[PDB]
């Protein structure tokens, strides 16, 4: 599959809320879409899995939900990262979006 | 049979010539539990169950009471108080194929461990996560079985072994399976200590 | 619960690189490992993955023909080898797995390696 | 209907040769001059300590039996069918017909799961008893010169089989394609008269009356 990640850049001051979006090229099960947070220079970590569930260690600053989203209820200095969506439907065709 | 789906043959109402199995050099494994391998003929049972299957060499060690592992827990489990003999031999030249004999499968994924002599032959895709697989393999959706790549070029630990486990069961019954009886020449016109049947 | 990735590599074009990650603190043998790569300043790309239990693999179509993923349970380690290396393969390689305890696994890749650079 | 068992139902207690001796033994025997049921059909009958059976067919219509408890596949049961040249004895969790029969077609059972045992080998008399796990069958086949009766004569039935089957028998039923009699054995004492050739030629039922006693 091909996943489209928008916006290309999300510029927003700390203390505010952010909206991120991932678009599938076909209808897919929400159960296989996950969101990752990549702090530059580091490996990414899982935030949301199954489209709507929080990963262990993820604060309530973040929440989950062809169009899937990631919501950041509030931004702290450590929440400035490039976000990616990843799809695991089936055995192959797995992929990541371009990165917010 | 595949180890995940072992073949149980019931032996009853017959004479068990255990001496053949014991005496031959065809076996690499002959592990007797609760019984003596040279006295098997004198042990009468209601039922003898022969569980027949193929596993790889490294897994032969799992066919025993008190053992754990992929075979002991998900395919063919023996009870801690197992009574009987485990007989096995190298079958590399019988089962292995040049391109790999993949007709033999074992269970890798299961919700829980097997009970002693439980035979679970389900092929349902194993759900490792909380997401229903619905017949589709993928992340956290794995087929529970995998084949053995049995080949003539494999090292011993990966060669096939044929395993037959003879489980000895004594019930509130006549005990119909016993070994062959000793007999000697009849001696007439002399005092002898005799035994005619009973 | 950590997945420890091997150090950096420098290889010539036309050759091959081997990278690996060791699992510790979790049930590696009931898990799965995916491999991804990221060039500096670029997006994270999927390379392929392996189911540790079954050893079955699948790959991204763009790498498929020249990439092999395997594992050895005795050292709790997942391996990936990339052949016919190109200069475009200069990237940081990452590995990841779900957390597993016996037969119960997480629903996403929570455990990640630190990232290792391969230069071609 | 009922009839007089007279002096029938005696069998050789064991596999022992005895010559010109009167031997006193207690075992399950059909009491002399006991009351036995005369059947013309094949309903399910109880099996107590053991059963005495007799039949008088010239066309060999009655040729089998069912023994067990539930007879509906819940427990093990014994099916015996004596057809043509091969009599088959089989023990399985049979699911029997509610009205089993043989034709002149086979409709005895619809299922036979978890089989544990199988063996194949005028006036006809049989004794069926289950002692300590062995189902012992005794039999005799003699001429018949009566049309609707049980002849007042004497023969001891010889052991046929001793099936080593762990079967609980509380009920039984006959199988037919004719008339038969059913009696029950009791733990009575008999004085058995042996001849010089090891056969039983006569017997006394010790509980019949004060003279026999
Ligand atoms: C058997 O008992 C019944 C009474 O229930 C009696 O009418 C019948 O005559 C008896 N038959 C014999 C042979 O004693
Ligand atoms: C008697 O009937 C049984 C039915 O199970 C059959 O198998 C057997 O061959 C028959 N005997 C003869 C002599 O045909
Ligand atoms: C089958 O018969 C054996 C006795 O020979 C018994 O132990 C076993 O439980 C029976 N199987 C079933 C499913 O009832
Ligand atoms: C018959 O049933 C009793 C239980 O009422 C049991 O103790 C006995 O062993 C059974 N006998 C056979 C031959 O199954
Ligand atoms: C016993 O057998 C002999 C033959 O050896 C025979 O002549 C004799 O009449 C028989 N006696 C009886 C009572 O059967």
Numbering used by the authors:
A (entry chain L): 2 to 66, 70 to 104
B (entry chain A): 348 to 545
C (entry chain H): 2 to 85, 86C, 87 to 121
D (entry chain B): 27 to 66, 80 to 143, 156 to 172, 188 to 243, 263 to 298
Report text from the authors:
Severe acute respiratory syndrome coronavirus 2 (SARS-CoV-2) infection is initiated by the trimeric spike protein that decorates the virus and binds the ACE2 receptor. SARS-CoV-2 infection is initiated upon attachment of the viral transmembrane spike (S) glycoprotein via a receptor-binding motif (RBM) to angiotensin-converting enzyme 2 (ACE2), leading to membrane fusion and entry into host cells. As for all coronaviruses, SARS-CoV-2 S is the main target of neutralizing antibodies (Abs) and a focus of vaccine design and therapeutic targeting efforts. Two mAbs, S2E12 and S2M11, stood out for their high neutralization activity against authentic SARS-CoV-2 virus and two different SARS-CoV-2 S pseudotyped viruses [using either murine leukemia virus (MLV) or vesicular stomatitis virus (VSV) backbones].
Electron microscopy structures characterized the binding and showed that S2E12 traps the spike in a conformation that cannot bind ACE2. The finding that S2M11 preferentially interacts with the S trimer relative to the RBD suggests that this mAb might bind to a quaternary epitope only displayed in the context of a native closed prefusion S. Finally, the enhanced binding of S2E12 to SARS-CoV-2 S in conditions favoring RBD opening (pH 7.4) indicates that this mAb might recognize a cryptic epitope not exposed in the closed S trimer. Hence, both S2E12 and S2M11 blocked binding of SARS-CoV-2 S or RBD to immobilized human recombinant ACE2 measured by biolayer interferometry. Additionally, both S2E12 and S2M11 inhibited binding of ACE2 to SARS-CoV-2 S expressed at the surface of Chinese hamster ovary (CHO) cells, validating this mechanism of neutralization using full-length native S trimers. To further investigate the mechanism of SARS-CoV-2 inhibition by S2E12 and S2M11, we performed a cell-cell fusion assay using VeroE6 cells (which endogenously express ACE2 at their surface) transiently transfected with full-length wild-type SARS-CoV-2 S. Although S2E12 and S2M11 bind and stabilize different conformations of the S protein, both mAbs efficiently blocked syncytia formation, which results from S-mediated membrane fusion.
